[PDB]
Structure 1
């Protein structure tokens, strides 16, 4: 939805909206994943059980962006050509139809394979991080 202040329960209705329109207001999830709502008894230990996993899940997602070269960017292009075997090369006609919740089932098996290629994009940078240009 247009407008990004909003609430986490103000944008998540994009889960059924078009996959193209859902790309707007993408920052609210990045805000919400941090802390959210959260003698010794059950709830006291739960505030250490759940809180620590919420942090560690966030760190696991961010460091993947850092390695891939997409640090700090919600949207991010990457130098990898889209293999037609993963999906047909016509999603530009289709993200107006599919929602993000529906796109995932297209690439369930291929997601872990694709992360290798995004890393391989970085070795096109890591190869070009020792040779010539930094004399500039």
Structure 2
């Protein structure tokens, strides 16, 4: 079920990421002012879906739910043991723990992929 893994550890939660993805659109697909409000709700849901998909594309992650990238992890963002992070901590806790650094990480992911694509075009 949707968010069934919300209290699960980060590692365990990743076992079924798909349920959180299919329900971003299936829940959309399944008085004048009332009509306008409903259109705003539907349009916004689409716009948010697309934003996230574009970011993954820009960062070099396409149809995968999990992508490794080539940006090094900074100990200045977070410096903790991987065993705790993946086995004894949940994603809700984790998101709260590193919510400061999302803007910088995203910028770095974008730059790395941009350089990679140029290098690949030259190497062909």
Scaled by the length of structure 1, what TM-score is found?
Answer: 0.81
Mark the structure with the bigger radius of gyration: 1
Q: CA RMSD in A?
A: 2.6
- Is this contact kept in 2: 1:38–1:47, CA < 8 A? no
Which residues of structure 1 form unaligned runs of 5+? Answer: 1-9
* Structure 1 pair 88–50 and aligned structure 2 pair: CA distance change class (3 A): same
3-state secondary structure, aligned to 1:20 = helix
Q: Which protein, 1 or 2, shows the higher relative CO under an 8 Å CA cutoff with sep ≥ 6?
A: 2
Q: What is aligned with 1:18?
A: 9
Scaled by the length of structure 2, what TM-score is found?
Answer: 0.88
Write the deviation string for residues 57-86 of structure 1: whole angstroms up to 9, x where unpaired: 000000001111101110111011111111
3-state secondary structure, aligned to 2:27 = coil
Runs of 4+ in 1 over 4 A off after TM superposition: none
The range that moved more, 96-105 or 115-124, is 115-124
